[PDB]
Amino acid sequence: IKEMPQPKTFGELKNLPLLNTDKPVQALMKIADELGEIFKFEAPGRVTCYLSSQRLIKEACDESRFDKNLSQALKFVRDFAGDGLLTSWTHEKNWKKAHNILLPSFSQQAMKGYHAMMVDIAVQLVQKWERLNADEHIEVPEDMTRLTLDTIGLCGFNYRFNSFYRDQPHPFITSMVRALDEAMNKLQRANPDDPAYDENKRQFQEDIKVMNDLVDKIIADRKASGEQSDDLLTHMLNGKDPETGEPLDDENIRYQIITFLIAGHESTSGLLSFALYFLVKNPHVLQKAAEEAARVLVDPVPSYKQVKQLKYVGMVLNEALRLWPTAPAFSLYAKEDTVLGGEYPLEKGDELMVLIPQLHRDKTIWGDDVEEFRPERFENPSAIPQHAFKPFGNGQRACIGQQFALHEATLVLGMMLKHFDFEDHTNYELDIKETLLLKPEGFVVKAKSKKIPLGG
Ligand code: HEM
After folding, report:
1. Candidates 399, 410, 412: which one to mutate for ligand 1, based on the most atoms within 8 Å of Cβ?
2. Pairing state between β 344-346 and 351-355
3. Could you tell me which of 70, 69, 400 has the C-alpha nearest to residue 267?
4. CATH-assigned architecture of domain 1-456
5. Which of 56, 144, 196, 322 has the most CB within a 10 Å radius?
6. Taking the chain, what is the end-to-end CA distance rounded to the nearest angstrom?
7. Does residue 248 have its Cβ closer than 6 Å to ligand 1?
């Protein structure tokens, strides 16, 4: 039984002066390098505990002792994501019900049905880049976000945002992105009911009606035609919880649709952008990956089977997730009084954060060279110690989109590698912007086409 390690406290400010940054996760990582696998963090009126070692994180992942907590971010996101799967407590009736209904629609098998729609958008991306003039360049996260949003839109509810036809995004995306940005901004707002934020709260209400109006209209449209589809909306309209026997109601269906867009777009865009960041910085890995892509992707458009044979591209994406998991933290609470790691007593309801980028640099698990980009670490996934690699969270509250995200990213990165050579023409210095997610801000490349025809 030990006192919990903790950074210096500064009077009433507690540990807050140590996070005077718009990159708190990276600052927290530096604090963990100093204090080790657990420290307590205090701010005026809040206390949390940050875990970074596999040894402790494997205890935190025992679901009989700790359940998912809604961070303050998730709470503010709940004002428009409602009781969709991401922003619900595990005890909510609609959590268990939407989970049981939705899980078969997110399985590896189910990816066979979304494949044609993911290729549709992936071809539009390849075509965009094929059509650039020499001397133009690519804005990487901006184009990955066009792709992921359009793919979730199409696979999710057969709606085309048509992001590659636009300078200014579709109104629904604008409202969604501004809603998220407002929810993030609220976290560091000292005088929230001040008059200066009345414009903020009106705009926030406008963006919610825009999102709701569109999604309610498409749901009602679909119920009136009876059209069936290869989309998640179809499954939610037809599905019944095997446990209660009930279906989702229209309002919850709307929240799940908004939730897929929130949960899937930025996180999957980051994963593709970081993977392409590490490849252009490690030309020898880029060549090995491009060699796989040429060997495997023999038809003008990839089959589902082919995507599954892209094992090295898969390793690349897992190593990008090791170094910079794009959702860098998830929050947990103690369900009852407990002792963590035989040393730290926790009281019922105490909060823990899992600092995933630090977890992923546990030298006792990964070897001393943790900063190096080595996809080969993932050659044999079953040999990786249990709970060492957690970019998709944990247990029943893990990412339901994991197979969808991975299949999407493998497909797209395999086609990028097949069709283009890449140049890091600005010698880009990694700049990791933090919102709810990580992304390599300002990352730009040039792509030189290999002149390989696409398909019907
Ligand atoms: C590679 C990109 C992705 C990463 C790194 C990621 C990561 C995560 C993480 C860490 C969680 C747990 C959140 C928490 O504990 O508070 C989560 C949950 C969730 N994600 Fe993802 N995710 C990704 C892609 C997607 C996609 C493409 C979708 C949807 C199509 C999606 C939908 C969801 C949903 C609905 C939840 C809540 C699941 C539940 O609690 O029942 N994610 N994801």
Report:
1. 399
2. unpaired
3. 400
4. Orthogonal Bundle (1.10)
5. 144
6. 66
7. no
